[PDB]
Scaffold this active site. Structure first.
Site, PDB file in Angstrom:
ATOM      1  N   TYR A  69      -3.891  -3.734   1.062  1.00 57.88           N
ATOM      2  CA  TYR A  69      -3.815  -5.158   1.347  1.00 57.88           C
ATOM      3  C   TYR A  69      -2.715  -5.729   1.841  1.00 57.88           C
ATOM      4  CZ  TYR A  69      -2.527  -5.831  -3.438  1.00 57.88           C
ATOM      5  OH  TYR A  69      -1.717  -5.923  -4.596  1.00 57.88           O
ATOM      6  N   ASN A 112       2.950   2.922  -7.960  1.00 58.55           N
ATOM      7  CA  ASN A 112       4.486   2.270  -7.697  1.00 58.55           C
ATOM      8  C   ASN A 112       5.338   3.156  -8.593  1.00 58.55           C
ATOM      9  OD1 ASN A 112       2.934  -0.094  -6.769  1.00 58.55           O
ATOM     10  ND2 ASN A 112       3.393  -1.342  -8.426  1.00 58.55           N
TER      11      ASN A 112
END
Ligand code: AKG
Ligand code: MN
EC number: 1.14.11.53
Length: 213
Positions: A69, A112
């Site tokens: 996104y 991450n």
């Protein structure tokens, strides 16, 4: 002094009400997943992924699988890479077996990877994009997830956490309710003293807004 302590503690209880934690993964099972995370980093470094799969920042890389996104919007289908088989086999399936999430819930996995001093600025996971709960599994080292911090400028500082949540290597953190919806979370630079990675597992809303081609 109170009312400060009383009011901070009261909101911290609200945040904690939307936090569940688990372990489940042994450290040996963590090392195995960590080896796969390293494989993803190497593959990205060789430019073998779709463009939007990999986002690079000074002390932090993000790797988007399943969905990516950006008022946030999902990318069009097929813009990011599919969830790797090992994420299903070693991580999602384990959490399903242990009843943390139901089968077929997860359709988005983000890795991450933080270098020391890395961080992620206070945010709320886009409520129009993602269902709850939001599940994360932490790897490589111990750190902490903070809630309610403001990232300030002039001078650069991070304000005091409403809640400081220790997150050990291998820890599973499940965010819902107040902790997911009514306050930000972040990783402070000061809490990443060594390399740490996290796998974030989420379900996108069926009506999540999506970019067109
Ligand atoms: O590093 C973490 O545990 C959380 C990172 C996060 O909240 C995000 O990437 O949206
Ligand atoms: Mn987040």
């Amino acid at each position: 002094e109170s009312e400060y302590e009383e009011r901070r503690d009261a909101e911290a209880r609200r945040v904690k009400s939307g936090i569940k934690q688990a372990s489940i993964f042994t450290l040996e099972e963590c090392a195995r997943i960590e080896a796969k995370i390293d494989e993803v980093v190497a593959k990205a470094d060789k430019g073998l992924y779709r463009e939007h799969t990999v986002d690079r920042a000074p002390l932090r890389n993000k790797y988007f699988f399943g969905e990516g996104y950006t008022q946030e919007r999902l990318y069009s289908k097929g813009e990011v890479d599919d969830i790797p088989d090992w994420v299903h086999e070693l991580v999602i399936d384990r959490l399903v077996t242990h009843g943390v999430i139901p089968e077929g819930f997860v359709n988005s996995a983000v890795i991450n990877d933080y270098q020391p001093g890395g961080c992620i600025v206070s945010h709320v996971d886009p409520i129009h994009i993602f269902e709850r709960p939001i599940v994360s599994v932490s790897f490589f080292s111990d750190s902490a997830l903070c809630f309610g911090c403001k990232f300030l400028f002039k001078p650069i500082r991070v304000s005091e956490p409403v809640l400081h949540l220790p997150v050990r290597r291998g820890s599973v953190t499940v965010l819902s309710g107040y902790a997911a919806d009514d306050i930000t979370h972040c990783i402070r630079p000061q809490d990443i003293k060594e390399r740490r990675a996290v796998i974030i597992l989420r379900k996108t809303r069926a009506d999540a807004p999506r970019l067109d081609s």
